Amino acid sequence: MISLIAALAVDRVIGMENAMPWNLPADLAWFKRNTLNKPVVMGRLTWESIGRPLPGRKNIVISSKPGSDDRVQWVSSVEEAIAACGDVEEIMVIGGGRVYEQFLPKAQKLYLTHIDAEVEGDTHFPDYDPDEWESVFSEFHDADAQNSHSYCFEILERRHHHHHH
Numbered sequence: 001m002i003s004l005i006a007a008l009a010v011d012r013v014i015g016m017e018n019a020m021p022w023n024l025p026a027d028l029a030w031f032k033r034n035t036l037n038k039p040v041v042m043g044r045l046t047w048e049s050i051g052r053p054l055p056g057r058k059n060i061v062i063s064s065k066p067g068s069d070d071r072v073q074w075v076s077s078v079e080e081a082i083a084a085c086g087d088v089e090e091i092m093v094i095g096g097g098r099v100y101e102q103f104l105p106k107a108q109k110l111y112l113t114h115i116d117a118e119v120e121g122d123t124h125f126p127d128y129d130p131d132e133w134e135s136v137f138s139e140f141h142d143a144d145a146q147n148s149h150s151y152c153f154e155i156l157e158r159r160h161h162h163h164h165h
Protein backbone atom coordinates (compact mmCIF):
# COMPACT_ATOMS: atom_id res chain seq x y z
CA MET A 1 0.00 0.00 0.00
CA ILE A 2 1.02 3.63 -0.51
CA SER A 3 0.60 6.15 2.30
CA LEU A 4 1.25 9.89 2.57
CA ILE A 5 2.47 11.49 5.80
CA ALA A 6 2.37 15.26 6.10
CA ALA A 7 2.01 18.14 8.54
CA LEU A 8 -0.49 20.82 7.50
CA ALA A 9 -1.02 24.28 8.97
CA VAL A 10 -4.14 26.37 8.31
CA ASP A 11 -5.18 26.52 4.64
CA ARG A 12 -3.17 23.40 3.67
CA VAL A 13 0.17 25.19 4.20
CA ILE A 14 3.07 22.67 4.24
CA GLY A 15 6.18 24.69 3.33
CA MET A 16 7.83 28.10 2.87
CA GLU A 17 11.29 28.82 1.42
CA ASN A 18 12.10 25.08 1.49
CA ALA A 19 11.43 24.87 5.21
CA MET A 20 8.39 24.28 7.39
CA PRO A 21 7.00 27.51 8.85
CA TRP A 22 6.71 26.09 12.37
CA ASN A 23 8.68 24.27 15.03
CA LEU A 24 6.87 21.19 16.40
CA PRO A 25 9.14 18.61 18.10
CA ALA A 26 6.05 16.59 18.99
CA ASP A 27 5.41 16.05 15.29
CA LEU A 28 8.91 14.59 14.92
CA ALA A 29 8.10 11.71 17.25
CA TRP A 30 4.84 10.99 15.41
CA PHE A 31 6.70 11.08 12.07
CA LYS A 32 9.40 8.67 13.25
CA ARG A 33 6.89 6.30 14.84
CA ASN A 34 4.91 6.04 11.61
CA THR A 35 7.84 5.80 9.21
CA LEU A 36 10.19 3.58 11.26
CA ASN A 37 11.67 0.71 9.22
CA LYS A 38 9.57 1.61 6.16
CA PRO A 39 10.84 3.02 2.88
CA VAL A 40 10.43 6.80 2.57
CA VAL A 41 9.97 8.51 -0.80
CA MET A 42 10.69 12.23 -1.20
CA GLY A 43 11.29 14.88 -3.83
CA ARG A 44 14.75 16.36 -4.34
CA LEU A 45 13.85 19.66 -2.70
CA THR A 46 12.58 17.87 0.42
CA TRP A 47 15.79 15.81 0.46
CA GLU A 48 17.86 19.00 0.33
CA SER A 49 15.95 20.43 3.31
CA ILE A 50 16.85 17.36 5.39
CA GLY A 51 20.51 17.23 4.33
CA ARG A 52 21.27 13.71 5.55
CA PRO A 53 19.62 10.24 5.55
CA LEU A 54 16.72 9.39 7.86
CA PRO A 55 17.99 6.60 10.16
CA GLY A 56 15.91 3.44 10.32
CA ARG A 57 14.37 3.88 6.88
CA LYS A 58 15.20 3.18 3.25
CA ASN A 59 15.62 6.68 1.78
CA ILE A 60 14.50 7.21 -1.83
CA VAL A 61 14.84 10.56 -3.58
CA ILE A 62 13.19 11.48 -6.89
CA SER A 63 15.16 13.74 -9.24
CA SER A 64 15.52 14.26 -13.00
CA LYS A 65 19.25 14.74 -12.43
CA PRO A 66 22.21 12.71 -11.02
CA GLY A 67 22.22 12.32 -7.24
CA SER A 68 24.40 14.49 -5.01
CA ASP A 69 24.63 12.08 -2.05
CA ASP A 70 25.64 8.41 -2.15
CA ARG A 71 23.97 7.53 1.17
CA VAL A 72 20.46 7.37 -0.31
CA GLN A 73 18.87 5.85 -3.42
CA TRP A 74 18.13 8.18 -6.33
CA VAL A 75 15.36 7.58 -8.88
CA SER A 76 13.91 9.55 -11.78
CA SER A 77 10.22 8.58 -11.87
CA VAL A 78 7.19 7.68 -9.74
CA GLU A 79 7.12 4.07 -10.97
CA GLU A 80 10.88 3.87 -10.37
CA ALA A 81 10.45 5.12 -6.80
CA ILE A 82 7.79 2.48 -6.18
CA ALA A 83 9.99 -0.16 -7.83
CA ALA A 84 12.85 0.84 -5.52
CA CYS A 85 10.68 0.28 -2.43
CA GLY A 86 10.39 -3.38 -3.32
CA ASP A 87 8.01 -5.84 -1.70
CA VAL A 88 7.06 -4.03 1.52
CA GLU A 89 3.67 -3.69 3.19
CA GLU A 90 3.69 0.12 3.35
CA ILE A 91 5.42 2.82 1.31
CA MET A 92 5.63 6.18 3.10
CA VAL A 93 5.56 9.26 0.86
CA ILE A 94 7.06 12.12 2.88
CA GLY A 95 6.92 15.19 0.62
CA GLY A 96 7.01 17.70 -0.74
CA GLY A 97 4.12 19.36 -2.56
CA ARG A 98 5.00 18.09 -6.03
CA VAL A 99 5.54 14.53 -4.81
CA TYR A 100 2.35 14.53 -2.71
CA GLU A 101 0.41 15.63 -5.82
CA GLN A 102 1.56 12.63 -7.82
CA PHE A 103 1.14 10.02 -5.08
CA LEU A 104 -2.18 11.10 -3.52
CA PRO A 105 -4.26 9.40 -6.26
CA LYS A 106 -2.38 6.13 -5.60
CA ALA A 107 -2.47 6.31 -1.80
CA GLN A 108 -4.76 4.30 0.48
CA LYS A 109 -3.86 6.01 3.74
CA LEU A 110 -3.08 9.51 5.02
CA TYR A 111 -1.21 10.34 8.23
CA LEU A 112 -1.84 14.02 8.91
CA THR A 113 -0.74 16.44 11.61
CA HIS A 114 -3.15 19.37 11.70
CA ILE A 115 -1.32 22.38 13.09
CA ASP A 116 -3.32 25.35 14.37
CA ALA A 117 -0.98 27.99 12.94
CA GLU A 118 -2.12 30.68 10.54
CA VAL A 119 1.11 31.02 8.61
CA GLU A 120 2.01 31.89 5.01
CA GLY A 121 3.31 29.14 2.73
CA ASP A 122 4.56 28.78 -0.83
CA THR A 123 3.79 25.06 -0.89
CA HIS A 124 0.42 23.50 -0.07
CA PHE A 125 -0.96 20.00 0.47
CA PRO A 126 -2.86 18.84 -2.61
CA ASP A 127 -6.62 19.26 -2.68
CA TYR A 128 -8.58 16.07 -2.17
CA ASP A 129 -12.25 15.21 -1.77
CA PRO A 130 -13.05 14.47 1.89
CA ASP A 131 -15.80 12.11 0.72
CA GLU A 132 -13.11 9.78 -0.66
CA TRP A 133 -11.59 9.38 2.80
CA GLU A 134 -12.64 7.97 6.16
CA SER A 135 -11.14 9.37 9.35
CA VAL A 136 -10.22 6.44 11.61
CA PHE A 137 -8.00 8.12 14.24
CA SER A 138 -7.72 11.52 15.97
CA GLU A 139 -5.40 12.67 18.77
CA PHE A 140 -5.48 16.29 19.99
CA HIS A 141 -2.68 18.11 21.85
CA ASP A 142 -2.53 21.62 23.27
CA ALA A 143 0.46 23.86 22.68
CA ASP A 144 3.17 23.61 25.34
CA ALA A 145 6.60 25.01 26.14
CA GLN A 146 8.18 22.99 23.30
CA ASN A 147 5.35 23.36 20.78
CA SER A 148 3.93 26.86 20.22
CA HIS A 149 0.76 25.71 18.44
CA SER A 150 -1.91 23.15 19.25
CA TYR A 151 -1.94 20.16 16.87
CA CYS A 152 -4.00 17.07 16.16
CA PHE A 153 -2.81 13.80 14.64
CA GLU A 154 -5.20 12.09 12.25
CA ILE A 155 -5.23 8.93 10.18
CA LEU A 156 -7.59 8.52 7.24
CA GLU A 157 -8.22 5.48 5.02
CA ARG A 158 -9.39 5.70 1.41
CA ARG A 159 -13.02 4.70 0.87
CA HIS A 160 -13.54 1.71 -1.41
CA HIS A 161 -16.53 0.11 -3.06
CA HIS A 162 -17.46 -2.80 -5.30
CA HIS A 163 -16.30 -2.64 -8.89
CA HIS A 164 -19.22 -2.77 -11.31
CA HIS A 165 -19.27 -3.09 -15.10
Ligand SMILES: NC(=O)c1ccc[n+]([C@@H]2O[C@H](COP(=O)([O-])OP(=O)(O)OC[C@H]3O[C@@H](n4cnc5c(N)ncnc54)[C@H](OP(=O)(O)O)[C@@H]3O)[C@@H](O)[C@H]2O)c1
Pocket residue numbers: 005006007008013014015016017018019020042043044045046047049062063064065076077078094095096097098099100102123
Ligand atom coordinates in the same frame (compact mmCIF):
# COMPACT_ATOMS: atom_id res chain seq x y z
N1 LIG B 1 4.77 19.94 6.02
C1 LIG B 1 5.21 18.76 5.55
O1 LIG B 1 4.73 17.55 6.05
C2 LIG B 1 6.25 18.71 4.48
C3 LIG B 1 6.95 17.53 4.21
C4 LIG B 1 7.99 17.55 3.28
C5 LIG B 1 8.31 18.75 2.63
N2 LIG B 1 7.61 19.89 2.91
C6 LIG B 1 7.91 21.18 2.25
O2 LIG B 1 7.56 21.16 0.88
C7 LIG B 1 8.39 22.05 0.16
C8 LIG B 1 9.06 21.27 -0.96
O3 LIG B 1 8.08 20.74 -1.82
P1 LIG B 1 8.21 21.01 -3.40
O4 LIG B 1 6.94 20.65 -4.05
O5 LIG B 1 8.83 22.34 -3.58
O6 LIG B 1 9.35 19.98 -3.85
P2 LIG B 1 9.57 18.40 -3.66
O7 LIG B 1 8.34 17.66 -3.93
O8 LIG B 1 10.11 18.08 -2.32
O9 LIG B 1 10.68 18.12 -4.79
C9 LIG B 1 10.34 18.40 -6.14
C10 LIG B 1 11.46 17.84 -7.00
O10 LIG B 1 11.40 16.42 -6.99
C11 LIG B 1 11.75 15.90 -8.25
N3 LIG B 1 10.60 15.17 -8.82
C12 LIG B 1 9.32 15.15 -8.34
N4 LIG B 1 8.56 14.36 -9.12
C13 LIG B 1 9.34 13.86 -10.11
C14 LIG B 1 9.07 13.01 -11.17
N5 LIG B 1 7.85 12.51 -11.37
N6 LIG B 1 10.10 12.66 -12.03
C15 LIG B 1 11.36 13.18 -11.83
N7 LIG B 1 11.63 14.03 -10.78
C16 LIG B 1 10.63 14.36 -9.93
C17 LIG B 1 12.13 17.10 -9.10
O11 LIG B 1 13.49 17.33 -8.83
P3 LIG B 1 14.52 17.76 -9.99
O12 LIG B 1 14.53 19.27 -10.05
O13 LIG B 1 15.90 17.30 -9.61
O14 LIG B 1 14.10 17.09 -11.26
C18 LIG B 1 11.37 18.23 -8.46
O15 LIG B 1 12.00 19.47 -8.67
C19 LIG B 1 9.42 22.57 1.14
O16 LIG B 1 8.98 23.80 1.67
C20 LIG B 1 9.38 21.55 2.25
O17 LIG B 1 9.77 22.14 3.46
C21 LIG B 1 6.59 19.87 3.81
Ligand SMILES: CCc1nc(N)nc(N)c1C#CCc1cccc(-c2cncnc2)c1
Pocket residue numbers: 005006007027028031046049050054093094095112113
Ligand atom coordinates in the same frame (compact mmCIF):
# COMPACT_ATOMS: atom_id res chain seq x y z
C1 LIG C 1 8.92 15.82 10.77
C2 LIG C 1 8.28 16.66 9.66
C3 LIG C 1 7.25 15.95 9.06
N1 LIG C 1 6.13 15.68 9.74
C4 LIG C 1 5.13 14.99 9.17
N2 LIG C 1 4.05 14.74 9.88
N3 LIG C 1 5.21 14.56 7.90
C5 LIG C 1 6.30 14.80 7.18
N4 LIG C 1 6.45 14.37 5.92
C6 LIG C 1 7.36 15.50 7.74
C7 LIG C 1 8.52 15.76 7.00
C8 LIG C 1 9.44 15.97 6.44
C9 LIG C 1 10.64 16.26 5.69
C10 LIG C 1 11.65 16.71 6.53
C11 LIG C 1 12.25 17.94 6.28
C12 LIG C 1 13.27 18.41 7.10
C13 LIG C 1 13.69 17.64 8.18
C14 LIG C 1 13.10 16.40 8.43
C15 LIG C 1 13.52 15.62 9.51
C16 LIG C 1 12.88 14.42 9.80
N5 LIG C 1 13.30 13.62 10.88
C17 LIG C 1 14.40 14.02 11.65
N6 LIG C 1 15.06 15.22 11.35
C18 LIG C 1 14.62 16.01 10.27
C19 LIG C 1 12.07 15.94 7.61
